[PDB]
Scaffold this active site. Structure first.
Site, PDB file in Angstrom:
ATOM      1  N   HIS A 173       8.643 -11.245   5.477  1.00  0.00           N
ATOM      2  CA  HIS A 173       7.695 -10.282   4.327  1.00  0.00           C
ATOM      3  C   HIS A 173       8.904 -10.070   3.255  1.00  0.00           C
ATOM      4  O   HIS A 173       9.824  -9.063   3.915  1.00  0.00           O
ATOM      5  CB  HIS A 173       6.833  -9.050   4.434  1.00  0.00           C
ATOM      6  N   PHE A 174       8.961 -10.438   2.149  1.00  0.00           N
ATOM      7  CA  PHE A 174       9.927 -10.129   0.956  1.00  0.00           C
ATOM      8  C   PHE A 174       9.433  -9.352   0.261  1.00  0.00           C
ATOM      9  O   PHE A 174       7.988  -9.075  -0.281  1.00  0.00           O
ATOM     10  CB  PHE A 174      10.105 -11.346   0.160  1.00  0.00           C
ATOM     11  N   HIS A 175       9.970  -8.180  -0.319  1.00  0.00           N
ATOM     12  CA  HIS A 175       9.681  -6.803  -1.490  1.00  0.00           C
ATOM     13  C   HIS A 175       9.703  -6.948  -2.397  1.00  0.00           C
ATOM     14  O   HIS A 175      10.844  -7.816  -2.710  1.00  0.00           O
ATOM     15  CB  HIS A 175      10.055  -5.642  -1.049  1.00  0.00           C
ATOM     16  N   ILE A 206       0.832  -1.040   0.026  1.00  0.00           N
ATOM     17  CA  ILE A 206       0.363  -0.144   0.259  1.00  0.00           C
ATOM     18  C   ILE A 206       0.745   1.256   0.606  1.00  0.00           C
ATOM     19  O   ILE A 206       0.149   2.410   0.105  1.00  0.00           O
ATOM     20  CB  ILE A 206      -0.599   0.212   1.025  1.00  0.00           C
TER      21      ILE A 206
END
Lengths: 131, 134
Positions: free
Chosen positions: A101-103, A33
């Site tokens: 989390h992976f970007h 987001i």
């Protein structure tokens, strides 16, 4: 310790909305987001850990498979020149949500590194199509 | 585009150039970055060649990510790091500099934000710390 009340745990439990591009038994991929570029996608395991350092090793396999699958799709969806993958551990690495989390961030030649839901949904449709 | 068998990491794998290795198994090599962004900055590569993440065999990624986790933990302990940044670059536009799959494992310190080579002897002292923290 891992805190089950974090925003991504809530996301997994459908407590808050998300704009999802892929989901299976092990993972969810969904739009950031606060994207660093159009099509910036995150991949999380459904099994909770703070980050990489505390994750069960077996959790990492479906996560990295999906990161790959999403990298390919994002690149194809936005005809990106490149893909940057990042994974942050602890405050000093600018980790802010304490769920692994992976970007996956698309990159364009010559471009150096809050978005309404409708735009993220436009972008998600493209990623879904390229899977 | 075709994989370049003469790329410097393929050459490292074939033992044609030296490296300061911290860890190795049948599938991966972890070794010191010679232009580190922070002391203890380590690279993890598959021994099996691919340009980057996009063209890698999915099976290759499993031992790679396991070793990335193992190294992230050893580097953080060995340097009493506040954090660990993992990065992986695909293509010129992502600033990938060597066209073989590699993950960066970078220790971070709170409030601490090139083409300068670090002397080999210094990389070794840093390697030993990491080797003991595994």
């Amino acid at each position: 310790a891992y805190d089950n009340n974090n925003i991504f745990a809530k996301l997994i439990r459908n407590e808050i909305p998300s704009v999802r591009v892929y989901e299976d038994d092990d993972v969810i991929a969904f739009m950031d987001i606060m994207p660093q570029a159009p099509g910036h996608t995150l991949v999380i395991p459904k099994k909770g850990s703070r980050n990489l350092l505390d994750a069960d090793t077996e959790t990492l396999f479906p996560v990295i498979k999906a990161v790959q699958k999403i990298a390919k799709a994002v690149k194809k969806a936005f005809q990106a020149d490149g893909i940057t993958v990042m994974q942050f551990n602890e405050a000093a690495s600018q980790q802010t949500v304490y769920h692994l989390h992976f970007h996956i961030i698309p990159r364009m030649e010559g471009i150096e590194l809050i978005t309404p839901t409708e735009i993220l949904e436009e972008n998600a449709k493209k990623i879904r199509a390229a899977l």
